[PDB]
Symmetry: D2
């Protein structure tokens, strides 16, 4: 064993894989990072040796993108991964590949609003039936499975309510009933929960949020448990033309290196903020998987590794007017905007910013209430973050 080689028979530990997974020094120059293959097409040696160097056209595959895919498959525990322009593109490619007219698809009723809308407003025109149900009890999923069910699509924690789904239990149900279990674990990250380890067949990630973690790029990933599934996704990505770009892949290769230390800091901050909010006399309810009152505490402790995440939610006393006054007065360092997962702490109101297309009776039915505030905790000093919330709450 010489410089440049791993020790044989040793599995590198987890943080080492975030730093080095999928990437060795460039064979040509020794460059320690992946060179960015900002290029459309690849020259072939001869007609007979077509594809002998592995690449032909960047819509189909690109070397920088492939380095990130290998890293993501390692981190998530999958056979292979495919990277996409956005998280929505990853989700839509799953629905495109694995559903056909007449099929039934069970979706957590608290899915990300984008997942919910691409199903209802687009794929349902192909006579695909999406049924939205409560995934908090796995027996609900078992009882709701119909003869035409092809896909069970879980999300955990859920955007924006932070409901959990028992991924292991649901995977056992789907394995018995021979249906595909797809899990969107964007809010968890693989540092907290790897659905493939818990039996899911496919994971979808919006790499926009925590894999990037810097508000820099859009991106998506599909991580497949098997070669058969991986090849189906890969084929359809080339047809739909929604692959990630090499430059986005370079950025994500760099930011993934710090995902463990970022998520540790964000989650330590979020625990302290959730505790503060839970004691605050102008806060009605606080939702965080790590505080003792979390309704699905036992599942959180079973299914979360290391941390309980950077996301929390709360409701201000006084209804919508008080929620709005609070939002309008939250000072820097907080940012009032959509998205989540970043070094910069973000405060969002789902009624207006993310789930505005959902009927208010239905919003209330899922738990998106009037004073409901979604919080993405960043890596600022937690005392500045609490000071800003306390000011805004005093104004509410």
């Amino acid at each position: 064993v010489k410089a440049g080689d791993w020790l044989p028979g040793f599995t590198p530990r987890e943080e080492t894989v975030y730093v080095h997974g999928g990437v060795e020094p460039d064979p040509l120059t020794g460059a320690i990072l992946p060179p960015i293959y900002q290029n459309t097409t690849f020259v072939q040696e001869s007609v007979e040796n077509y594809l002998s160097k592995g690449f032909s056209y960047s819509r189909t595959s690109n070397p920088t993108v492939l380095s990130l895919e290998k890293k993501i498959a390692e981190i998530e525990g999958g056979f292979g991964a495919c990277c996409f322009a956005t998280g929505m593109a990853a989700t839509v490619t799953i629905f495109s590949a694995f559903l056909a007219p007449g099929d039934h698809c069970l979706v957590t009723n608290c899915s990300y609003g984008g997942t919910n809308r691409c199903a209802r407003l687009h794929f349902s025109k192909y006579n695909i039936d999406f049924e939205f149900i409560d995934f908090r009890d796995p027996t609900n999923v078992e009882k709701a499975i119909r003869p035409q069910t092809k896909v069970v699509f879980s999300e955990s924690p859920c955007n924006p309510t932070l409901y959990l789904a028992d991924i292991e239990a649901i995977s056992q149900i789907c394995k018995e009933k021979k249906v595909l279990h797809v899990c969107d674990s964007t809010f968890a990250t693989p540092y907290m929960m790897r659905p493939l380890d818990l039996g899911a067949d496919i994971v979808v990630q919006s790499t926009t949020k925590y894999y990037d973690g810097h508000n820099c790029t859009l991106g998506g990933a599909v991580i497949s448990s098997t070669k058969e599934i991986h090849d189906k996704v890969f084929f359809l990505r080339n047809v739909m033309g929604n692959i990630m770009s090499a430059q986005t892949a370079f950025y994500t290769l760099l930011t993934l290196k710090t995902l463990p230390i970022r998520v540790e800091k964000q989650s330590a901050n979020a625990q302290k903020i959730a505790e503060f909010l839970s004691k605050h006399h102008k806060v009605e309810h606080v939702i965080y998987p790590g505080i003792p009152s979390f309704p699905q505490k036992e599942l959180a402790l079973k299914q979360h590794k290391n941390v309980h995440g950077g996301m929390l939610a709360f409701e201000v006393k006084g209804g919508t007017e008080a929620g709005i006054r609070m939002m309008n007065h939250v000072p820097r360092p907080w940012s009032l905007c959509e998205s989540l997962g970043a070094c910069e702490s973000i405060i969002t109101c789902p009624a207006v910013f993310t789930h505005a297309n959902m009927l208010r009776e239905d919003r209330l039915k899922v738990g998106i209430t009037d004073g409901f505030i979604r919080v993405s905790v960043g890596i600022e000093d937690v005392n500045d973050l609490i000071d800003g919330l306390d000011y805004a709450l005093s104004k509410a």
Copy 2:
């Protein structure tokens, strides 16, 4: 009026629009190029003033991308444009938006292979009927339209045969039958043919090819004739998550500046190469709209502005074996690879690469003969290009 203003009541001439369309100096700093908005999310001033500055999240819209879209809409003569991660993503968004189960779509039978395979594999599973016909006679289109026809999808010149479609005549037919006419004018560029000027309802572009012209980025664009069509495309792009990235849009904003002078040089080179090939004893047939043997020379003179383009094709005598010997010996500066439209001259044999997914019997049905070679002419010195072809032909 003053420095920094266009004079009111004047319309810039063609080349000026390539340099300046869609862009003004940054209002904040005066930067002569738009900055790159390499950022996911946009801060809002208040819950009330939501979207008051025009942006919320870059999957939906991004300022750099919107500047490119405004330029492209100006160059193509449309109401608005949407930009995509690839040309295939643009095409697939048209099929996704405008077709539903039971609908019918007419597609030119010599389409780019990717258009053909996204139809035939994928969308056909939704009980959408795609019919491939010969667009060289508009009455074929008129006769094949059904009550269920929603889209007529032309391409001109066609990939790889360079057949022309009479866009004005087909538009007249489609207007009478109230069917959408979508035209893929990637091979023409708007400098040679603007389908919206000739009555098409939608234009699809692979910006990868000539708009980029440098083998640098992938990209697509959909240019809509009306607000109603544009809004449908924009909505579905947000759902499918296949928008162009800001960094790609910046590259294409830069490269579009030189499209007229690039296409003029490529086309002058192509005319000379086509004339050379038409006299060479190893060459069976040459296809170029600018030489007198072109079968649709009358339509080329009616429909082509400025140039006859950088693309040509030819058949080497001696069939497949001769074509392969030739390809294996084409020297630099030629590149043996997929793609087209670039400063670097590219050659390929579609029977063995791009359209090798098509049955040889069907290959011949669509004119891709055994010795057929697609040539994308770049901006090198034409004597190097001709000397290289002459050397390669000596090995056939």
Copy 3:
């Protein structure tokens, strides 16, 4: 000879070198463009095989930068080239490497104001004597050479007056007197004049201007006639830490591909604009090397290949007030700003924007008069450019 090889014993023609110089397809993947080596450090195989793959640290050399250097040395006709963060960095590295206290340096008195200021205001504190003289007559240079003269630094055409220097004649003088002849040919480009072909020992370029040509990047280059000179420049670049970045090198590799067609278009536009101005009743003087009244016409015809360039200058009748009114009313597509060489046409007034640090009596002495306007012609439609000048002149 097979695909991927050049024909042996053939020198590729000039436009082919702009497209392909310094770049072959990536050996690892076949990528047709140079991958961007966005990376600081390079891993070594062993202590003994240090530098066996050619790279160690990007301040010293970087693979993308080296690909551009090889291309620039080919285009300019030099032994080697070194690329820098800016044109000023290239110039300052020359002064740093080849002058020491007690040395005399002859500088064209109409040098770029930055060259003039770094000499007067900085290197003169090291007791280096910069003497500014009229380079229009080579015998002036011969007569002004002193025992301590080490460097003769010409520029042609000169910024902003467009005076020419006879590079061949001056090189003969410097070769006889054993002094180094450095030529800044930024305004010419190697498509119009290659000083190394005319005997200069070093060329300095601001790649910012025409090599980029898109207002995108800053950059500089030093092209050396010999290995001894090249190695001295390379060594000092590593010490001064002013190398070009890989991303800037990637952009310049792409934009250099179109330098010939850009400069042809800009120069055809500039000829027409200079003719228009020379007939205009509110224009006092027009300076362009291609119009028949140019005072150094005979030298322009001897020393310029293909074109007479994109730069021109003129004076409006009515002195400074009229020049200012004209500038304030020049409409789009023109831009009022510093810099030059770009696809976007630029109008500058040197008194305020570039040579404001020069005493007004001295400005007048060099020819930077009151109504003096420097024009950089882009690739817009020339009729829009003339329309805009004619409007502004009517307002002046």
Copy 4:
């Protein structure tokens, strides 16, 4: 006050400044990150309103670069900062601005090798006297100052020996003698030591190392204690043409966000590795400010905040041959290369690489013994790092 404002009268705490210092949402669009001003020149509103929007030409200043400069000045506690293409460019600008013929400069004799060689080769030719002395005792500095001394240039910890300099004491000396105290605190980072807080007049940083922390960019910064010093640095940067690019500034704006959590992880790992090495029988000496054998432990406790850093050094028993056997067998995840500060752990032997330009007798004079190894600890799992060192040491 309102969303988007800092509360007046409050100062953000340390980690918040790393996330948000120097940056506010884009005023035009609300973009949460500053856009990349990848552009050379800036349009002016009128000849009169020249520079009214703050920018003219990116060699002089660029908006993205200025945002980074504001962040860096906040983090380091300075009046202002200037950013450069590399750390060497920052250092060379100090020597260029503040020294003239006849002046004297005191430099720590264990400086980074590049500082030492830019002094000894290059600036000494201008009759500037550089004197290299041992900064571990401040009275050496006091005794060596001459009437001609203009600059005292410290480094702490030193590259590669990790000697400390007492920055507060040296500043007191320099204040008494009215000499500029410049401190290169690259190895410390501002999270561990801010020399401006301890009385230094100027700080030099290689942002390549920890500010970047990802082996992605080269860069430098000069942080000035006063407006007069800042203005001198800014003026000369424009003359030397060695400003940082906008794209580099964007990368560093992103990576600085995580400097506290990166340095905390690197330092925790380094403490454990130093303790492991201090017990290993093949290791002669270990140098780390956090272990009790550190010779300057009293100063380390006074001068180091939060951590003792990611850098350590050790000597392998058996001299040069043993060091080489060890280096040749250090396995992944270690990288054998130059540079330091990164997420990827780096090891090198300065006698054979970084300081092999120093005479072995002088190498030993400055403490770089034959078996001396400089170690830059990254953020991998410490057990992989320790297992790899243990394997390598078994080959020594």
